[PDB]
Design a protein around this nucleic acid. Structure first.
Lengths: 93, 78, 108, 96, 108, 93, 80, 96
DNA sequence: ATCGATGTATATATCTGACACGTGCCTGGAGACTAGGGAGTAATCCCCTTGGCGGTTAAAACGCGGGGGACAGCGCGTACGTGCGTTTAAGCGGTGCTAGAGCTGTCTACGACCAATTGAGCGGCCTCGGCACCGGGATTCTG
DNA sequence: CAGAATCCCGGTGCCGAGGCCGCTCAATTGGTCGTAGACAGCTCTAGCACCGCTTAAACGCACGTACGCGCTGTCCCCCGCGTTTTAACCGCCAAGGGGATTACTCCCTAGTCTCCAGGCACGTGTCAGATATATACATCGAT
């Protein structure tokens, strides 16, 4: 069997934020749990938002609303700009 | 400034239902602030659900869902 | 046949858009998944990951160390008034506690 | 003349309001407050008649429980008068 | 083509097994739903309903009434140690509180 | 247009427990919301149990385990007893 | 059995010191032992329930993580 | 001989244990307690090496948090010594 | 021992609108058959859990001296409760307007399902320098 | 202000983190096609505004008593230090119960079509509960 993980992507981000710093295996296990936690929380609220409106499809509006409901004010304020920029560049490509 | 509409007698009645026998003179201004902070967190969520649906009328279900998300399930309003 | 290019490279992200789209389909959250959902979710997860790692690295530097350890993650989360609100119900193994003593207990 | 001693009417009011179930806050002043708070989020909003009733029921149910908790932490200090620090301690231990 | 008869009549239940089976399939909880799941869930919901109604009806007689109202449901729930644990976070409109005064407050 | 509620079945149960008592519409509304709440709790936990074991189907084993996790010690024993009785009567019909 | 007595007085003092307690009354020890036993019983009942549903005989770390998650407290570092 | 006044060492211990990170309960006694409690639910059970460590981390975090809440309840009564009623009050307000 | 002034509750009659029941009908549950892949059974590998021995110092258990903290009692002075007269505006009953929630119809842009291709990232291996332990010196803070 | 506790610096040395290789199965490109949902138009529910009136409730004042607070005394139970002992921790050796995987095949659930009865709106009417009046009898405070 083969197990997937986010370790390589977390390391790429670390190398972008602090090139000289390293990370221990235990810290990597914590980060790998934090990512799955927030993923399940956002996907859960996006699913509830779809059923309350009788829609059959999840879209970027469901993700944006779930983000505004879950994260605090300043974090939500920045995360919404990051997601909008990413989707705009992807569609323009 | 409508917070003054929550009068001292009403606060005393609420304290009586809670079993309080004697009340200090500074409890009123503390209670007004506590209620003002509580209402805002529910209204912000209700308006968020109203806007997602592109409606202009806030509906009872928006409030029911806003309260349930905070862990305060309310039975009786559907 | 055109040479393949990954969706993450098109969006400019580091996280895997393909894996996120797969997970969204396998979890049964809904019967249809739009093309814009995984790019938005990947961008949000990347933002929060970098936001935490920066504070952890600063804590590691203040302690004069080079490797980040769970103590530094605990110190990073509990010193930020917004991260501590999102992660209030979470306990981190080997994290310890923040130094704090009630003023009434200190000697005159 | 005739006059009751301090505290007998308070106990009679306690026995009164714990038996009844009506709402204790004035409806129209509360409605104006709800209208005033919502204006900071969106303009020209409309409210269904039942939304204000759901909000009023939730607020009164919250305040009664908070006073119930505050009275125990007042008695613990061997006092009978409730004071602000009792509310502050209850809210700190409740985590809100 | 024999004459149709309901699954609830075969199981001996009052609640609708067919509606429950439909609601399970429409919720996307899983891609497949077995035959026995709705009969078991219907029996459980019927049990909890009968227990609540029995206690509320007893509370109605103690007040010489003939019609159940929310006050009787509140008194029925808050006076039972098992139901009160399951419904600890639920708020019932028009229910009110239970009568209780601390012994320290009564007259000397 | 056409709504859907359990008021018929709740009334049928009421006339078996207390054939001399009636119920007000306001109480019926609370009884109607109670069933929807417990239904959603049990179906939720059953779905998680199925996902953890990597199974595609929901069976009576998932319902029984969810009931044993959600209901208190005395309610659980009776609920499980009559759930198994109902299933046995259905399968033997 | 006597195994509850294995939570000695010094261990309780060290825990109280981490929490900032300066002076401790002599009756706190039996109260702390009673408070701890019910917590362990509640978590272990759920863990064994998950173990039995899987038909396993060994109790794994995931059963503990899921039990704590159900009680409303999340543990990071052991899996999930 | 030189002797420190009452309480001087307690503050030093507080600083020491707040700055450290290791576990404080003995491993073997706790492991035997865990295996004893489990025997009431199912016989001949087996445990992984990591399940006991997860349970120990959870129990120590719970107890440290409860002592943090209890110390505020002690100061509210103007005392320094913590007593059982402080624990009972904290647990009652937390709703445990 | 009790009086007597207030308060809560009970018993009888009148009213009204909330509840229980019957009717019409339509859309969603039940009967019958087919196709196919999810779950059940049996067999093998091997890994990690339980059990035991030897031994050495870190940690717990037991005594005792004394001092500083918890508790009860007293005085005092002012904050809150009870009761009255005044005045504010909540509640109700009625009429009228129109904003916008809910629905039907048309149709075209979106996402799901197949097949062929190949390179992204997971498992096994190597190695070297970040960390930790020992010992001695410098600085702080307390009784 | 003597001296006990914490920190830091120079030297030793090892095993955990960083980097390489092989390779296979999960992601991309290209095509078809069915229906989900975006837009336009209409109906008519119920949210908003204004008026007049009665009187329930909020407001402002006086006064006096019961409570909160600060001070003093005393006695006993926590803390700090020393000696003895007991069982935790480390390291090394055995063996076998149970977890994880593969291969086969059968029986369970999904899907389509017909058809018919369960239960949802609508209408009616009669009695359970709400109210006004009279009065019984229980309690609280002073003599």
């Amino acid at each position: 069997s083969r197990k997937e993980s986010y370790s390589i992507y977390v390391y790429k981000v670390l190398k972008q934020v602090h090139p000289d710093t390293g990370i221990s295996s235990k810290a990597m296990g914590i980060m790998n749990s934090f990512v799955n936690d927030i993923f399940e929380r956002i996907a859960g609220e996006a699913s509830r938002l779809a059923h309350y409106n009788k829609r059959s499809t999840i879209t970027s509006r469901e993700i944006q609303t779930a983000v505004r409901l879950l994260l605090p004010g300043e974090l939500a304020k920045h995360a919404v700009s990051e997601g909008t920029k990413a989707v705009t560049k992807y569609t323009s490509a | 400034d409508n917070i003054q509409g929550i009068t001292k007698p009403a606060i005393r009645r609420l304290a009586r239902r809670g079993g309080v026998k004697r009340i200090s003179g500074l409890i009123y201004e503390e209670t007004r602030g506590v209620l003002k902070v509580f209402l805002e967190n529910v209204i912000r969520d209700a308006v968020t659900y109203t806007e997602h649906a592109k409606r202009k009328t806030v509906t009872a279900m928006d409030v029911v869902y806003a309260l349930k998300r905070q862990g305060r399930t309310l039975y009786g309003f559907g | 046949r055109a040479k393949a290019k990954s969706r993450s490279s098109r969006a400019g992200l580091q996280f895997p858009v393909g894996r996120v789209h797969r997970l969204l389909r396998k979890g049964h959250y809904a019967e249809r998944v739009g093309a814009g959902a995984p790019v938005y979710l990947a961008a949000v997860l990347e933002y929060l990951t970098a936001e935490i790692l920066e504070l952890a690295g600063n804590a590691a530097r203040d302690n004069k160390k080079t490797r980040i350890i769970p103590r530094h993650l605990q110190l990073a989360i509990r010193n930020d008034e917004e991260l501590n609100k999102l992660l209030g119900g979470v306990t981190i193994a080997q994290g310890g506690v923040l130094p704090n003593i009630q003023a009434v207990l200190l000697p005159k | 003349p005739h006059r009751y001693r301090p505290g007998t009417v308070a106990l009679r009011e306690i026995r009164r309001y714990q038996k009844s179930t009506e709402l204790l806050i004035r409806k129209l002043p509360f409605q104006r407050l709800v209208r005033e708070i919502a204006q900071d989020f969106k303009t020209d909003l409309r409210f269904q008649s039942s939304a204000v009733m759901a909000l009023q029921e939730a607020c009164e149910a919250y305040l009664v429980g908070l006073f119930e908790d505050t009275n125990l932490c007042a008695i613990h200090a061997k006092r009978v008068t409730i004071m602000p620090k009792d509310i502050q301690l209850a809210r700190r231990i409740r985590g809100e």
